[PDB]
């Protein structure tokens, strides 16, 4: 890794995703493994595809310095082994509930699903919406 260049550029990616993203989700592996990851991130790849990119760097002085511009509701996620995940490929997505079920199903947990707000949903699976 180099510096501010890539940092701020990955932040551009952030804005990119939030620019038309819906209910962004929180992500924080506690004790998961790469073998699982082979079909884990691959499964997000089966969700929207190139969507999920868990660029861990929840540093309050780093990724958080890049947060503000869009969905500042994201800050709350700052301290400890946490990260970010949006929903650019998904206006009005069900993508959020996927995390709940898996929160208690083979993944230990991922920030116990709480997300942010577009369809007015904190820790709440986006239930009342056409599939």
């Amino acid at each position: 890794m180099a510096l501010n260049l890539q940092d701020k550029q990955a932040i551009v990616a952030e804005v990119s995703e939030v620019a038309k993203g819906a209910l962004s989700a929180v992500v924080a592996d506690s004790r998961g493994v790469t073998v699982d990851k082979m079909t884990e991130l691959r499964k997000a790849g089966r969700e929207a595809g190139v969507y999920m990119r868990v660029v861990r760097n929840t540093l309050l002085r780093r990724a958080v310095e890049g947060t503000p511009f869009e969905c500042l509701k994201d800050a709350f996620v700052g301290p400890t082994l946490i990260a970010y995940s949006m929903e650019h490929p998904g206006a009005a997505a069900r993508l959020f509930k996927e995390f709940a079920k898996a929160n208690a199903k083979f993944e230990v947990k991922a920030a116990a699903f709480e997300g942010e707000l577009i369809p007015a949903s904190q820790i709440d699976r986006l239930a009342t919406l056409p599939t």
Binding site: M38, L41, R42, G45, R46, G49, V50
Partner: protein, 141 residues
């Protein structure tokens, strides 16, 4: 639902786990059941085409109810198949020898797609081209 015990990934014959290294004490030090392994494997993989060392993962249960996990025969083996090569090179990328066809590998990268990393067959096809690096083969369109 058991996870850790004797779960190791080992290449084994698609329907011929009889030799010592493929079966023998290779799973013997791990203490794996030749018996039923044969019965079921054969009984079901007889329908499966034989002769190619497909990877399999031994998955043991609490009272020993095994689950062999065959993926897809080796890309190196698929290369021996579709490319029609019998051997790669003692010099991978130093002396490329086996002739190959991109689309063949792409469809074979679709089988491997059936089981790999991500979503796009093409990225997985690059992995197969990477496999071609691993063994030293001449590429052909």
């Amino acid at each position: 639902a058991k996870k850790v015990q004797a779960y190791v990934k080992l290449q084994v014959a698609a329907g011929m786990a009889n030799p010592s290294p493929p079966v023998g004490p290779a799973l013997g030090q791990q203490g794996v059941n030749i018996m039923e392994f044969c019965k079921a494997f054969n009984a079901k993989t007889d329908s499966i085409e034989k002769g190619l060392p497909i990877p399999v993962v031994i998955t043991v249960y609490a009272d020993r109810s095994f689950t062999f996990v065959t993926k897809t025969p080796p890309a190196a083996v698929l290369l021996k198949k579709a490319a029609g090569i019998k051997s790669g090179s003692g010099k991978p990328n130093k002396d490329k020898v086996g002739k190959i066809s991109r689309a063949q590998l792409q469809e074979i990268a679709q089988t491997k797609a059936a089981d790999m990393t991500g979503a796009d067959i093409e990225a997985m096809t690059r992995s197969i081209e990477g496999t071609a690096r691993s063994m030293g083969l001449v590429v052909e369109d």
